[model samples]
Target chain A: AYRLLNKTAVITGGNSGIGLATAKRFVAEGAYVFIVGRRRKELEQAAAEIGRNVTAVKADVTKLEDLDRLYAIVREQRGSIDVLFANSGAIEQKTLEEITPEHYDRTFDVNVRGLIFTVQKALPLLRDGGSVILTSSVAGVLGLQAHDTYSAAKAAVRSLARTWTTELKGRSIRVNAVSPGAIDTPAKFAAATPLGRVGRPEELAAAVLFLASDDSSYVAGIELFVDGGLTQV
Target chain B: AYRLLNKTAVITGGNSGIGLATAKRFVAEGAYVFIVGRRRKELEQAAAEIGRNVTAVKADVTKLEDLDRLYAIVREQRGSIDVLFANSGAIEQKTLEEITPEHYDRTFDVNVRGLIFTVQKALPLLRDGGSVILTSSVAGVLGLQAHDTYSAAKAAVRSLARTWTTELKGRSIRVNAVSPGAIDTPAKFAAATPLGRVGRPEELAAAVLFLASDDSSYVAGIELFVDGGLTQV
Candidate 1:
């Protein structure tokens, strides 16, 4: 039986990376998914790649109005959301000396500020009992040297899940963060992990699927580090 | 201001809860905290009392040669060891009516065996860059219905802090775990959670003083969750 058969999900940054992979998983698990990305062409391609049961919404998560429009579409098309993966984020390595205000703003705008509105606006359309999985990184807690801006923003993302977990408890909306360790998308990322490898997009997608489904009915407000034990020791 | 102040530390059941509030925050954050407990009276009376930096080893972390005579008296009179907080474990809640004999042996032996071998059996002496903390429970990831064998022995003490953070990642020697959800020391645990409340033990000793010190520099193998949010929703 499909885990998400009658469910609807909205995934930010669904055109690529973890979001795209999770979108694919959600569709396979029987969900109707709306994927938001900044690039119209990439969004269309991703939608096509998902094959079916997916809608592509071309919008930048940082744009509050764009998020409003996305949720309006969700409201009109699916009535309500069952799972929301606020996974859109950017990463750039910059030391304190080299960091620019623009770099910090851009990262936080998309990762934190953008993500906040993404979920906040979706609340009305988010069914009483739903799942929200935020994409955080091991960098959030790892205190990586050159990743100050990105890591801090991701840390905020993790904190939101904690806050929202309490705020949304009344309706039983489970909110958790999924922190991926060196993913295999690029070879270098994989090498640094203790597992001697990077993780597959699919591997993370499986975890999202678990969180988004009844399998994680009891899991909430936790940062599930799917890092192949990279940060575990 | 040295966090451990070149002091020795030990923590068994550590007298009372969260191991005597992390031996009173590792003696007001400058270390020299030895603690253990199996007796209520002795626990309340000895240096086990919160007001000092000292020793009191008398308990049962499944007592294997009383942990080689408590690390041979910390290698005979505080010769070494910067930090160690591998707390004792015991939780008894059973649901399996047909629970087997092996199940009995396995569960009891599980916590003792896992925790006993957690620290320096086997330590020449904990050197610089040393920090070890392990005591996890949101009932080891909150499936909470029947946590018979102490939730698979705290999910293998959270997989031994990801296998000792990849075998001590070039000897930075930081290993941490803090999984306290609804603390048992008092009734407030029931009134203050997403499930309504409960937590006692100084928010899990402030995450064991941030995995024992320099404010968690680089924070390896993360598992901190004092969880006032409790495991609900």
Candidate 2:
């Protein structure tokens, strides 16, 4: 049986990379998905690639109005959402000395503020008993100073998942974070590798699917690190 | 795309409980599995229930000769194995005061010695890049007196996973442990739970599949606690 059969899902940043990969997986598992992104071209192409059980909504998560429009479409079509992935994230690695006011603003806007409202605004459409996954980075907990703003914002994601776990207990909406390291998405040390290689997008998608499904019904409020055991270091 | 397409797998204790459940999942994911169990009757039945892509071998893992025979068949039939799940385990709960020498002997014989030889003896047939998953219990680290022998033996499983990680590094073999706390397998604490209910067999199996499949290729040398975040305690 399909894990997400008949479930309704909404994924921000679903146009490419990990989010698009996950949206495709959700559809394969029998879920109807509303994919959000800033560019209509890529979003529509991703929808085409997904082929069916998909809706492409062009909207930037950093903008409140964009989120409003995205959710409005989801509400009209699906009536409710069973899973919400607040995955549209940004990272411009800069040390404290190199950080600009513009740098801090943009990083937090996408990673923290965008992620916050993405889930908060989805509440009206999100099913009370549904699941929520935040794409947190290993940098969140790794404490790398060069990635100051990005790390701090992601650390906030992990912190919020905990707070939301308590706050959303009444609604039974489970919240968890999936912290991944340099995925597809990086290359520096095969020799320094703990997991042997960089992660693939589908790999992260698989982890997200597990949290999204009933398979993890007994799971909540924890960071599921899809970061290839790097946290061990 | 199925995760285990065309892969070869070997699962011990595959006739019943979590082991059997995982065999079904492995087959569904497109692997050819050879399941080992002590009882010939139930072993064959487990294969029948799986319907196809499975071979049941009646062999107790505690018996090194039995393990020898099991691998010979695999080496001939499949040439090499992609995954080896040393899952056959035993537990006899007794406090320190009630424990007998015979109790200590049998507990380690099945859980510790049986587990060690199961993977150790699989060397020649196990692919260099294969994954080895040991079924460990959360009881291993819980430090409960009532489960003295069981705890001690399971604790050894965790320790061995570490040793094997280093030992198997030459072969590029990945070793991991999946620890599940009181699964559907228990009751009485929906309220006390960090996760809503007692875990399910498939839930545990899903965690195992993540390890068994390429989805977790970047995952190795760690305990993936399917214990529903119980360790968070």
Candidate 3:
């Protein structure tokens, strides 16, 4: 049960939803979890709920200052990180014809660019043999119409796992992605797929748990779909 | 450690290689495994190596009558099955220009057609909430150039897991594929990927155990590639 025993995990987008749930899981699995997000109030609240072995850091991942601050705090506190879940992401849903530059930047900033630095900065503090999991979506892989800009960013997130798996191979760090379709289960939401039961955050967390722990040690550069089989269907 | 405690597992191509290694693991993990193969002598030897809680079923998986008989025996002896690893597969390496009908049948019969019935016939005996894993290769998803025919059959093998996951959702049976590259490890084989050290069979068995058990609860319709990082690189 102590899969992440004494490990340090940094989760972006930790203020709510999947990130928050995953933070709780990492802590529960014996990790010292650092929850990162732009809003201090939400980060405070998320840390409160997680209640143990958690630290909340307020940082807009798009800015390198905040990104460094987050890592610096992690460096000072834990000294070494064993897991990094670059889950800080957002989406702007719009049809291709209706897409705009503002829409593209906002989505890419957090989903793609923000993620790029999140890991890049963390590598110094991240220990060898550590694991990195990115939060991508089923839309990127499946190409959902009208979710255009956001899906592309998500697809970009997916590519990072590929290149980084190669890039970070020297350090023995693993990079993988979790593609979620609307939030859900493998079976509980047979009807829970793509979108069902509003997708309890814990369902997504369980998958993050798998990628984070030694259970998936032999696994690398792969995308674990928690999208309830959306790509399959 | 007892992931398959007291479980019943039916493995095709259990006479050698990945399947044989998996059989030993299943039994070691407390499963009463039935090893299937066309060659009786080796199948028996595989069972012997497995040492206990193993039954060797000799029959070509391509034959429907033999498929029925095999299931019949399982029904009479065990009354139910919890895991089915449809790993009986072969590849005939040929350039596209050199591909022939015989090459197609030999590969398709064992990889695709035989796998289809192996799961279909086992459905009655396959308990609800069971797991079905097929042996597919990274070449199927990646599309290896010189091995076109073999890769295509592997592609077909990959497709069934998708269709069946959608088709059998009501039954709560999880279907997935292990896309191994040559055979191998997640990190130890970082140098071990695609084709490192020829990929020890046990490394492949570890992945099968994950797919065959409750460890991958949220996993479905996934092709878990065990080919080192063949697809990623």
Candidate 4:
């Protein structure tokens, strides 16, 4: 049986990138899911690709209305959220001088503010022993120039999991974050990591699913970096 | 000339604790200092006892106005902050079943929110390229009973430094965080630490000063944990 059999999960930005990859893995592991995105076409495409085990919700993470609607869909469809991946985030290359107010707001809005509400909204439907997993990045700890805002936002995401772990400790809900290093997505891979090549999305997804399962029953308020020795040592 | 030369660096909660011990060592290096705490009479008496360059600031980190006034006094006299040690945080023992909202909020307000504003308001007076150091405990990394909120808040502080590193990256300002393992603060020194005893605050401070100085010029957005091999291994 799949590790997540009969589990109901909600994944933001689950239409593509790491989000889509995680959805595919979670589905294979026997979880029914609500995959959210800003673009309806993309959401449907992902749903068609992920099969009926996935439900598509079109919404931008930046909007409270969108988050509410997305959660409502999950509530109506699934009685409770067993696993949540607040994985919707963006990364752009920009030096400090090139950073505009819009860039700052967009990055923080999606990565920090959006991720914040994503888990907060899931609180009601989350089972007592539920797991909340946030998507962070190795860049959060990496001090490369031009990656400032994105890295900062990811850092905030890491902090959110820690703070929320305490905030939700009473519910026995475990909250943790995963910061993936250079992953072998369709995007460019970094030779900066010791692993030589970028990690596959499934590598990161495996960690997420592990945290989502009882294998990490005691792990909370931490961000496990899957960067393949990029930031460590 | 050293930015922190001859000037004082006050750390709160320092008596027989990380503050007092670190104060003893900071005196050895070059900075005269004050360590603040609620036990005012105790702190003052300890200051007198410590002898040489150590004073006291009797204020709780929770009160915003107290922190405002604290920074104000530092600004008026010091004219600029060469380096700041934002190393005041704790983990009260309370298992998940025993956790209260007040306890959780108190931890966050003190650790995450308070620590954030502490550095934020100090920005104007902080010397350009000055080092800002925050204390994060290893509890933020692993799951410990009754430590949910504490870990989360410390994690937040770590992220805060990353964000601030970007926010002030243009000024050549470096913001970093320190995560202590079991440290030999008088409160609850333990031999369980991998190093056999809790770390000395001086060791932690040395690392802090290193980050504060030109030695770490290329380093930023880091949370260097001085926990005698506690987090990993």
Between candidates 1 and 3, the TM-score winner: 3
Residue B183 of model 3 has an lDDT of 55
C-alpha RMSD (angstroms) for model 2? 3.4
- Every model: iRMSD: 12.5, 3.1, 3.3, 5.7
Q: Which numbered prediction scores highest in lDDT against the true structure?
A: 2
Ranking of predictions according to DockQ? 3, 2, 4, 1
Candidate 4 chain A: 10-residue stretch with minimal lDDT: A95-104
lDDT of candidate 3 over B79-160, digit per residue (tens): 9999999999887788878888998788888888999989999999988889999888878876556788778888888888
- What ranges in model 4 sit over 4 Å off? A1-7, A12-31, A35-51, A54-133, A144-177, A180-233, B1-5, B12-16, B28-30, B34-43, B50-66, B93-104, B159-176, B184-191, B199-224
Residue-level lDDT tens digits of model 3 in A61-163 = 9999999898889989989999999998776679988878888788888788889998899988989889999998877866566888888888889899988
Error of 2 at A21 (Å): 2.3
Q: Per-prediction DockQ, in order?
A: 0.09, 0.31, 0.32, 0.13
In model 4, what lDDT does residue A182 have? 79
Q: Candidate 2, after superposition: displacement of residue B213 in Å?
A: 2.4
Better of 3 and 4 by DockQ: 3
Compared with the real two-chain complex, what DockQ does model 3 have? Answer: 0.32
Q: TM-scores of all models?
A: 0.61, 0.85, 0.85, 0.65
Per-residue lDDT tens digits of candidate 4, residues A1-233?
A: 68999999888988887888889899999999889998889889999988869899998887778878888888888889999988998887765445554665566567766775676667778999999998888876765666766775676567667666766878898988899887766534456667778788888888999999889998887779898787886
Each candidate: RMSD to true structure?
Answer: 15.6, 3.4, 4.0, 6.5
**Alpha-carbon error at B157 in model 3, in Å?**
0.7
lDDT tens readout by residue for model 1, A1-233:
48799899999988887888889889888999999998999899989899999999988888889988887888889899999998898888899999898988888898899999999899999887799999999898886789999999998999998899989988878898988887655366555665455677887887687668764554568887777556664
CAPRI tier of model 3? acceptable
**Model 1: docking quality category:** incorrect
TM-score of chain A, model 4? 0.96
